[PDB]
Design a protein around this motif. Structure first.
Motif, short mmCIF file in Angstrom:
data_model
loop_
_atom_site.label_atom_id
_atom_site.label_comp_id
_atom_site.label_asym_id
_atom_site.label_seq_id
_atom_site.Cartn_x
_atom_site.Cartn_y
_atom_site.Cartn_z
N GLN A 23 26.43 95.98 4.61
CA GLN A 23 26.76 96.80 5.77
C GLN A 23 25.82 97.99 5.95
OE1 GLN A 23 30.80 98.05 5.28
NE2 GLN A 23 31.66 95.99 5.56
N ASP A 24 25.42 98.61 4.83
CA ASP A 24 24.52 99.78 4.83
C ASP A 24 23.04 99.44 4.59
OD1 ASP A 24 26.94 101.17 5.14
OD2 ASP A 24 27.03 101.85 3.05
N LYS A 25 22.61 98.21 4.88
CA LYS A 25 21.28 97.76 4.48
C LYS A 25 20.14 98.45 5.24
CE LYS A 25 21.07 93.62 7.37
NZ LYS A 25 21.66 92.25 7.32
N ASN A 26 20.44 99.02 6.41
CA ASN A 26 19.47 99.78 7.20
C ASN A 26 19.59 101.30 7.08
OD1 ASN A 26 19.97 97.14 9.48
ND2 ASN A 26 18.09 97.43 8.32
N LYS A 27 20.50 101.82 6.26
CA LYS A 27 20.55 103.29 6.06
C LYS A 27 19.45 103.66 5.09
CE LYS A 27 23.80 101.92 8.20
NZ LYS A 27 24.06 102.01 9.67
N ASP A 28 19.04 104.92 5.16
CA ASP A 28 17.94 105.41 4.33
C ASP A 28 18.16 105.14 2.84
OD1 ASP A 28 16.18 106.36 6.36
OD2 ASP A 28 16.98 108.39 6.27
N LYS A 38 9.27 88.11 -4.94
CA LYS A 38 9.49 88.44 -3.55
C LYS A 38 9.65 89.93 -3.36
CE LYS A 38 11.71 86.72 0.55
NZ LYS A 38 12.64 85.67 1.06
N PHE A 39 8.79 90.51 -2.52
CA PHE A 39 8.91 91.91 -2.18
C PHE A 39 10.18 92.14 -1.36
CE2 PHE A 39 8.17 95.43 0.86
CZ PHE A 39 8.23 96.47 -0.06
N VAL A 40 10.91 93.21 -1.69
CA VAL A 40 12.09 93.59 -0.96
C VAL A 40 11.90 95.03 -0.56
CG1 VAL A 40 14.62 93.81 -0.94
CG2 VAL A 40 13.50 92.07 -2.36
N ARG A 41 11.79 95.24 0.75
CA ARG A 41 11.55 96.54 1.31
C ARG A 41 12.80 97.43 1.17
NH1 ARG A 41 11.74 99.36 5.93
NH2 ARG A 41 12.92 97.75 7.09
N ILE A 42 12.59 98.72 0.95
CA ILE A 42 13.68 99.69 1.02
C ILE A 42 13.64 100.35 2.39
CG2 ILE A 42 14.65 101.81 0.10
CD1 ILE A 42 13.41 101.02 -2.61
N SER A 43 14.79 100.36 3.09
CA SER A 43 14.91 101.00 4.42
C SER A 43 14.57 102.48 4.34
CB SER A 43 16.33 100.86 4.99
OG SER A 43 16.59 99.50 5.30
N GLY A 44 13.73 102.94 5.27
CA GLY A 44 13.31 104.32 5.34
C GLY A 44 12.10 104.67 4.49
N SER A 64 4.21 102.37 -13.67
CA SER A 64 5.28 101.87 -14.50
C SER A 64 5.89 100.68 -13.80
CB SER A 64 6.36 102.94 -14.73
OG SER A 64 7.04 103.26 -13.52
N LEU A 65 6.42 99.77 -14.58
CA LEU A 65 7.16 98.68 -14.06
C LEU A 65 8.39 98.68 -14.89
CD1 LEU A 65 4.13 96.22 -14.00
CD2 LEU A 65 5.31 97.16 -12.00
N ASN A 66 9.54 98.90 -14.26
CA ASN A 66 10.77 98.85 -14.97
C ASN A 66 11.88 98.47 -14.04
OD1 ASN A 66 11.78 101.39 -13.73
ND2 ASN A 66 10.17 102.38 -14.98
N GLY A 67 13.10 98.50 -14.57
CA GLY A 67 14.28 98.16 -13.83
C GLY A 67 14.97 99.27 -13.11
N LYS A 68 14.39 100.48 -13.09
CA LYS A 68 15.03 101.62 -12.46
C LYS A 68 14.69 101.59 -10.97
CE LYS A 68 15.87 106.56 -13.04
NZ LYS A 68 15.34 107.83 -13.59
N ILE A 69 15.42 100.73 -10.25
CA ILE A 69 15.25 100.54 -8.82
C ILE A 69 15.64 101.84 -8.11
CG2 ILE A 69 16.05 99.29 -6.78
CD1 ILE A 69 14.24 97.63 -8.57
N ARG A 70 14.79 102.29 -7.21
CA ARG A 70 14.97 103.63 -6.62
C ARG A 70 15.86 103.59 -5.37
NH1 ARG A 70 11.32 107.03 -9.36
NH2 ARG A 70 10.68 105.75 -11.16
N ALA A 71 16.14 102.40 -4.84
CA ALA A 71 17.15 102.26 -3.81
C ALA A 71 18.52 102.81 -4.24
CB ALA A 71 17.28 100.82 -3.38
N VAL A 72 19.36 103.13 -3.26
CA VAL A 72 20.63 103.78 -3.54
C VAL A 72 21.71 102.75 -3.92
CG1 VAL A 72 19.96 105.70 -2.00
CG2 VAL A 72 21.50 103.96 -1.17
N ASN A 73 22.46 103.07 -4.97
CA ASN A 73 23.70 102.37 -5.37
C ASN A 73 23.55 100.88 -5.63
OD1 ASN A 73 24.67 104.94 -5.12
ND2 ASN A 73 26.19 104.49 -3.55
N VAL A 74 22.49 100.52 -6.33
CA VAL A 74 22.27 99.09 -6.68
C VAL A 74 23.11 98.78 -7.91
CG1 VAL A 74 20.56 97.37 -7.31
CG2 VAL A 74 19.93 99.23 -5.77
N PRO A 75 24.10 97.85 -7.81
CA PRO A 75 24.96 97.69 -9.01
C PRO A 75 24.26 96.97 -10.14
CG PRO A 75 25.64 96.15 -7.32
CD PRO A 75 24.59 97.05 -6.68
N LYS A 76 24.56 97.41 -11.37
CA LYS A 76 24.08 96.75 -12.58
C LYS A 76 25.10 95.76 -13.18
CE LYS A 76 20.89 100.42 -14.08
NZ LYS A 76 20.55 100.67 -12.65
N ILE A 77 24.58 94.69 -13.74
CA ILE A 77 25.37 93.67 -14.43
C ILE A 77 25.24 94.08 -15.88
CG2 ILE A 77 25.46 91.23 -15.12
CD1 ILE A 77 24.04 90.78 -12.23
#
Ligand code: MG
Length: 395
Positions: free
Chosen positions: A45-50, A269-275, A368-381
């Motif tokens: 639902q929030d995929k286009n918010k900053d 696959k590149f996944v763009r972050i909105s904003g 750096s290449l790591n798992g600390k995705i800078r997008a907001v609220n990405v849930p971890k398993i």
């Protein structure tokens, strides 16, 4: 019937233990999955918010920090460097001023100082703000303890880095035992260092990545430095992990008027972050339409360094809007690859008085290449899907 029975008996005790623990592990898995699915419904639902992923998914690779990892380096054609040679090089030329204020300023290191006669070693010697420099700072971690093995590589040469002793890395809630990276100097790099050498500072914590430099103490026009990074992660049984859309963070893709930091030649696959300033264009990931150095300049929304303004200092590990210079790559398979570097703007885009000036730059980069995705609220398993225990059969 010798240790066949003893093995069966050992496996039966272990089966009994797993059977007892299985219901709680299943419950915890089920509760976490339910949480993740609700968090993902909101991210869709929030995929286009900053700051949100344009294509949201859960992070299966927990890979934020490994301060205690152990580093092993091998190169068939390169030169691993003695610590004392690395230390001497830091004390002279362009890094001297900071070295005299007890600071290791990696981006000022004149790497010609490393090219001495009797410099080679057979195994890694760590250098950084450690030992007699435990009270020193580095520009990459400030007061935090950082250290690296140093290697000299020419175009086409590679170093293989193995990182073991990992305390906090998990894939699909199972512990990662070992990470292997092969780093290669991309032959098409345009740096001018007459020897042809590039210094790689390979940090002991693989989540901090690599400092790669050909800087000789002067800026260079129409320069570049690219490092190919091939990697494999290993499971508790020392087997390669076959990733299934693990998220890899490519952060700090800085673009100034004379300088573009970029990822290319990547698997997945590149996944763009909105904003974000970062997008993909012609297989390259960088700030494609605007600069991102200073508010108002070349179309940048924010200022990369902290000046006082709102949303300034986007470029650091902990800043809430660090996604402004970040993207994500969804990776799969057991062997993955990406090339990171920095290049003079005029080699990439048309010359332009605001967007791409001819002014020389330093051929260096910390990435750096790591798992600390800078997008907001990405849930971890964090919870594994438990395998139902199988009772073993007797000899
Ligand atoms: Mg950067």
């Amino acid at each position: 019937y010798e240790a066949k029975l003893a093995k069966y008996q050992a496996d039966l005790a272990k089966y009994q233990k797993d059977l007892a623990e299985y219901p709680q592990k299943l419950k915890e898995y089920n509760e976490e999955q339910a949480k993740i699915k609700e968090a993902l419904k909101k991210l869709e639902q929030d995929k286009n918010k900053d700051g949100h992923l344009t294509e949201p998914s859960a992070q299966s690779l927990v890979y934020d920090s490994e301060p205690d990892a152990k580093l092993s380096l091998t190169t068939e054609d390169g030169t691993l460097l003695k610590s004392s040679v690395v230390d001497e090089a830091f004390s002279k030329s362009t890094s001297k001023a900071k070295y005299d204020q007890k600071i290791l300023q990696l981006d000022d290191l004149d790497i010609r100082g490393l090219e001495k006669a009797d410099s080679a070693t057979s195994t890694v010697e760590l250098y950084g703000n450690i030992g007699n420099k435990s009270t020193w700072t580095t520009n990459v971690g400030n007061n935090t303890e950082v250290k690296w093995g140093s290697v000299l590589l020419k175009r086409g040469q590679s170093v293989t880095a193995t990182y073991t002793n990992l305390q906090k890395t998990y894939y699909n809630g199972k512990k990662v035992s070992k990470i292997v990276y092969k780093y290669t100097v991309d032959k098409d790099s345009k740096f001018q260092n007459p020897s042809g050498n590039v210094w790689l500072g390979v940090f002991s914590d693989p989540t901090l990545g690599v400092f790669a430099s050909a800087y000789t103490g002067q800026v260079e026009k129409d320069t570049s430095i690219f490092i190919k990074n091939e990697f494999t992660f290993y499971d508790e049984n020392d087997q390669p992990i076959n990733f299934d859309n693990a998220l890899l963070s490519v952060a700090s893709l800085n673009r100034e008027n004379n300088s573009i930091e970029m990822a290319k030649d990547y698997t997945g696959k590149f996944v763009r972050i909105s904003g974000s300033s970062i997008d993909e264009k012609d297989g390259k990931i960088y700030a494609t339409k605007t600069l991102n150095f200073k508010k108002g300049q070349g179309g940048s929304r924010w200022t990369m360094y902290p000046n006082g303004q709102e949303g300034s200092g986007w470029d650091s590990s902990d800043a809430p809007n660090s996604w402004y210079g970040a993207g994500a790559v969804k990776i799969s398979g057991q062997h993955n690859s990406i090339t990171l570097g920095a290049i003079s703007a005029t080699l990439v885009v048309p010359s332009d008085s605001v967007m791409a000036v001819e002014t020389g730059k330093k051929p260096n980069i910390w990435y750096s290449l790591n798992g600390k995705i800078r997008a907001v609220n990405v849930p971890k398993i964090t919870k594994e899907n438990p395998t139902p225990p199988v009772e073993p059969t007797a000899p």
